[PDB]
A paper describes a structure:
[name] (HA) is an IVA surface protein that allows the virus to attach to host cell receptors and enter the cell. HA is a homotrimeric glycoprotein, with each monomer composed of two regions: (1) the head, comprising the receptor binding domain (RBD) which is crucial in viral attachment, and (2) the stalk, that is responsible for viral and cell membrane fusion in the endosome. Mammalian IVA infection is initiated through HAs binding to α2,6 sialic acid-linkage galactose receptors on the host cell surface, before entering the cell via endocytosis. Following endocytosis, HAs undergo conformational rearrangements due to the low pH of the endosome, leading to membrane fusion.
The full length mature HA1/HA2 trimer crystal structures are as follows: (1) A/Fort Monmouth/1/1947 solved at 2.95 Å resolution, (2) A/Jiangsu/ALS1/2011 solved at 2.35 Å resolution, (3) A/Almaty/32/1998 solved at 2.05 Å resolution, (4) A/Hickox/JY2/1940 solved at 1.95 Å resolution, (5) A/Netherlands/002P1/1951 solved at 2.5 Å resolution, and (6) A/Melbourne/1/1946 solved at 2.55 Å resolution. Comparing the structure of A/Denver/57 HA in complex with [name] Fab to our six other HA structures showed differences in the [name] antibody binding site. Val148 and Ser158 were both highly conserved, with one exception being A/Jiangsu/ALS1/2011, where these residues were Thr and Asn, respectively. The antibody [name] Fab failed to bind many of our other IVA HAs, as examined by analytical size exclusion chromatography. Failure to bind correlated with an insertion in HA between 146R-G147 of the epitope, whereas sequences without an insertion bound the antibody. Our other IVA HA structures all contain an insertion near the [name] Fab CDR3 binding site that appears to prevent antibody binding, via either insertion of an Asn which becomes glycosylated to physically block [name] binding, or insertion of an Arg, Lys, or Ile into the [name] binding pocket. Although the insertion of either a glycosylated residue observed in the electron density of our structures (A/Netherlands/002P1/1951 and A/Fort Monmouth/1/1947) or of a bulky side chain which partially changes the loop conformation (A/Jiangsu/[name]/2011, A/Almaty/32/1998, A/Hickox/JY2/1940, and A/Melbourne/1/1946) appears consistent with the loss of [name] antibody Fab binding by analytical SEC, rigorous mutational analysis and quantitative binding experiments would be required to prove these are evasion mechanisms. Interestingly, these insertions do not affect the identity or the positioning of the sialic acid binding residues, allowing these strains to bind the cell surface receptors while eliminating nearby potential antibody recognition sites.
Numbering used by the authors:
A (entry chain F): 3 to 324, 332 to 456, 458 to 486
B (entry chain A): 4 to 324, 330 to 359, 363 to 455, 459 to 464, 469 to 484
C (entry chain D): 7 to 322, 334 to 353, 363 to 460, 478 to 486
The structure:
């Protein structure tokens, strides 16, 4: 009549790495690394993104006629630019501080387009009906931006223009306008009558006075002239004032903005689908339940922390064998014991049988669960971290931004990789010691029997099922 | 009988471990400072500079409302409040203002000096009429203390030319302005000439401006504007001013000394006659622990800022009035009666004691653990806030990504280090107890740690001789 | 049963105790260099020597040796790199220019506007100056052409170049601001000139201003230098009525890996290295270095540590009832003299795995040298320094604390292997005691 102390074994092929040994097969484990995505752009928590499509932000904000899809867009979760987002300023010219404008829009959660200077009434002394061009052609007729008004002279007079707008929206207002540089003096006079004109735009936080220059630039969309585009964010209660003797591409529509938290701009060619997610990358959406991911650095939503690891497997059970206990004097696990991690086997006159010690097993399960959750809890969820954009004269800032991203990426990959290596080694020694503690618990309790040596004990006396379950209960 | 056992007391202190939360321990040491004195103090005896109702612009330009600041020549740090609103009393823009503040944040002392003495520097122009209602002082039109509004003498404004070579042995902050009158009549009244220019040149700075007659909306009755400019003139370098009008000339400049411990702070807390080695905008810190969660903005030698609400490190053992079966094992509880150490013996014969040998080794080891964690933690020298204009959002967000990124790293390092070291410290005591039992067992068994043998013989067993 | 002892005096720290003598250990810190500037993976660096980048790119005549430079591994500036714009003036966006050149792997100088044929209506033979004197004769930059009037006429200049090289072309030019109206008329005839330079990504129209600046090398005038990167298929167009210091040679560029500009006075030698610092080359085999924070190549992480000694063996059970090690046992870590290859090889495999894991998870720094900020970029400069210093503290902390914690685990690791060997005879001899059969484990 014998009893043995032993541990659990199963058919698991899970391997984990530890600080002392690599690829160790264990009975239970949890993967902490997401390495897959669904290959779709999804809504974030139910809110669709804004797909700029063939338009870029400039074409969107200016109101390029090819971007009319976007005019009613007022609410989105993030902004998508594709490889075909090429429709921008149809009348050629540069947007000043374009990357800053994009950075501003990347946190916008609500966008309300309104007619800041109504076309029909704002400009009684000028002509509002002729500012169209073949460069902004739409459905076979010369056209122009939906959000700007190309004002020209009325008759043969362009009087001094002055127009103010006071923001009473209760939110900041995005105002856009332009300054036109004709290619010849004849075009200057034809459009604006006066020569040597100026355009001045002012608020309490903004001031710029421009003198348009006449220069013939290389032809883009038949245009040797240029329009330089400008924008500013007007605060509640602040007043923006336009003054011009010509060349003013006036605001027609502007946008009352609310800023949110979880949005950004993403560059992706993947398709939007009517799926939803808490975490989106340019390649596809992530499930976002594990603390780490190696799919993409650019995330939007509440996302696992990005690491360069290819695997982050955490040991929870013990070494799978189907302080000298596991693979020691107790040379192997019991696949026959299924209800727990540590337990007993007994040979009897009434028959054989495995039983698991729930007391020590639950303590081990409680401790390891606390270990895993602590590792998950100490890792922070990676709120929206989008891409950042730099112009061609910002290489040092771009490289500074790149050094930051790469430095934290190395730090977090190191911390995760070493934590799992060290915690896995400690977890296996934890189980090893609990078995050794359980072996000594019966040995220091049957001391009437002799240590067979292999985790077992031969009872020098008859020991029935009552006698067995008594030793297990700790009351023997 | 002799019993091997461990210490227990009346402590309710709890610590977290990687395996268990809320573990009551007999001894522990706080590593997280979470309180402040609500005061702005001197740094090691050095008074801060309270700008009060003035901001940096008003101080540097010399807004007449900032005259009381003129007696300040050395400070430990600079304070702006929610009411620091007195700046440019004559409206207009300060160029590269966030850079000027960045430069001044490491200045600990400066010397205001009369770079172009008003009485002698401008013989061919008028220095006696450059006042405005916009800069009123005591009910009279006035002007900046550090700039001079030069106008025409009689009906002529000749070409102005003046140089200054910095021989102060320090960088000199030079400030000036260019006036943009609102009407051609005002241009003629003040400067006679039209189509004027102002040029300012040194070996590291060059700018030629043509003033523009423009009617801006009235601020403090002024439809005109003054644009302010500054530069740091190196030792041995020369700055040259040239103008046919519209020059708001330097009158006073500042020879700067940069110090190791100083910054600009935004705070509404009051200055008091306290001193501190570590200051935040909310109040001063004691600065004894390696971590603090009061504020990211520090001045002095300060604990590292973390987001943690508790950083509790175990030094004693589980408190019971485990891994190795001794503590919370066969010895089911601690001895409140044993007070002289962590591990020891209780004996009973015909006529509690602490094992000083076993206790001292563990005390020596745990002190080393705690000290190592403190020494590896570095003092956080002065880290102030940075400022960005409304067209510097990307840089502002890059700066914030850096602050937040290192903040998350150090919060992780502190919290997880404590979580893992607490587990090892409790397992350390548990193992030291099992070793004390097995040492007695290897000499002489009831089970709970417990020939006639009096005191000489027992105390010998404690001594290890039997 | 016993453990190994030898004559090593190596000391290591652990979280629980400092200065513990160990039988074997490994240093994880490279703290020495060969005091030489070497080639990187086989590619010679570019020594600017007494020229700075401006003098190199403009083609200051004192920089003629550099004209053959087409491929380098990194660029070296010395404390005597002072030959720049010999005719005084500055490059707009000069730190950006340097940042662009810091990543260039191929450089092909070509004659964008051939001086003998590009300017038939202007004079190409008089744009020389005592300020750029060479071999006792007035001279000028090798890469720019100082065009002046032909006879008494300076007609409107118009020259385009279309980039068809299939790679970016660095184009450089200048705009001259004479000190007096007489010099303006003498050089360019016209009084109210302009220079406009345009591509699809660049446009600037400048009106030169006649101003007498302080004399630098006898020049009261100034030349403002400009640069741009012209994309494939794009056209740059120059138009001017005077004051144009025109392109003469430009540069077809290929972008390479993340090398940089180094400030160093060490001498270049015919050595090669995987990792270079301004003080000297590193062997680059260990995961950490404290030689210099400025690295180029595949380099160990920079730390503030003076020592990073990792225990691999045991202290010279241990230091308990067994009051000492056997200096006489030489064949292994544990044994009975004979060493147990099972017990010793298992520990060697594990400790070798621990050492390798610390090294394997450590990444190369791959940093960048010479981040420069102008005098109005102090906030950006301080931001860059906050990043460098912040990671320095993190890695110094991670390295030092890792070594403290793993050393304690290593010394207890050996201690437990001794107890397991000691218990190995007890679970074998049973009650037959108070040889090769016990060692084999079959007794
Ligand atoms: C284990 O056995 C089950 C059948 O019960 C089988 O489906 C599975 O593939 C086997 N292997 C693992 C690793 O679970
Ligand atoms: C979108 O969802 C609807 C209903 O869930 C489904 O009919 C449709 O196929 C989905 N995909 C589309 C519209 O591309
Ligand atoms: C500008 O100055 C000139 C002198 O050169 C004078 O004749 C003219 O009247 C002035 N113009 C105005 C508007 O004051």
């Amino acid at each position: 009549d014998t009893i043995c102390v032993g541990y659990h074994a199963n058919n698991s092929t899970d391997t984990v790495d530890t600080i002392l040994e690599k690829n160790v097969t264990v009975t239970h484990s949890v993967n902490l690394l997401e390495n897959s995505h669904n290959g779709k752009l999804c809504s974030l928590n139910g809110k669709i993104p804004l797909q700029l499509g063939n338009c870029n932000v400039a074409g969107w904000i200016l109101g390029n006629p090819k971007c009319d899809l976007l005019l009613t867009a007022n609410s989105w979760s993030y902004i998508i630019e594709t490889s075909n987002s090429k429709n921008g300023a149809c009348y050629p010219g540069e947007f000043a501080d374009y990357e800053e404008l994009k950075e501003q829009l990347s946190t916008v959660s609500s966008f309300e387009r309104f007619e800041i200077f109504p076309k029909a009434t704002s400009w009684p002394n000028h002509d509002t009906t002729r500012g169209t061009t073949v460069a902004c052609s739409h459905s076979g007729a010369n056209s122009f931006y939906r959000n700007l008004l190309w004002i020209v002279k009325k008759g043969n007079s362009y009087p001094k223009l002055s127009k103010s707008y006071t923001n009473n929206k209760g939110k900041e207002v995005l105002v856009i306008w332009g300054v036109h540089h004709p290619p010849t003096d004849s075009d200057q006079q034809t459009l604006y009558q006066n020569n040597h004109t100026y355009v001045s735009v002012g608020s309490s936080k903004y001031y710029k006075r421009l003198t348009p220059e006449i220069v013939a630039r290389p032809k883009v969309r038949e245009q040797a002239g240029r329009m330089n585009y400008y924008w500013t964010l007007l605060d509640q209660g602040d007043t923006i004032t336009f003054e011009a003797t010509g060349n003013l591409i006036a605001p027609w529509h502007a946008f009352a903005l609310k800023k949110g938290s979880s949005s950004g701009i993403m560059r992706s060619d993947a398709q939007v689908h009517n799926c939803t997610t808490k975490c989106q990358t340019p390649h596809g959406a992530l499930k976002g339940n594990l603390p780490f991911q190696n799919v993409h650095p650019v995330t939007i939503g509440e996302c696992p922390k990005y690491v360069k690891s290819t695997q982050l497997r955490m040991a929870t059970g013990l070494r799978n064998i189907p302080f000298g206990a596991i693979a020691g004097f107790i040379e192997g696990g019991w696949t026959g014991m299924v209800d727990g991690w540590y337990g007993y086997h007994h040979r009897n006159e009434q028959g054989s049988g495995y039983a698991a010690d729930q007391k020590s097993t639950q303590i081990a399960i409680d401790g390891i669960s606390n270990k895993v959750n602590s590792v998950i809890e100490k890792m922070n969820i990676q709120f929206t971290s989008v891409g950042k954009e730099f112009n061609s004269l910002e290489k040092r800032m771009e490289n500074l931004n790149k050094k930051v991203d790469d430095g934290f990426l190395d730090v977090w990959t190191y911390n995760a990789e070493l934590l799992i290596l060290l915690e896995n080694e400690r977890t296996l020694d934890f189980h090893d010691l609990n078995v050794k503690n359980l072996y000594e618990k019966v040995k220091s309790q049957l001391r009437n029997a002799k240590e067979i040596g292999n985790g077992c004990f031969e009872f020098y006396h008859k020991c029935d099922n009552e006698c067995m379950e008594s030793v297990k209960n700790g009351t023997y």
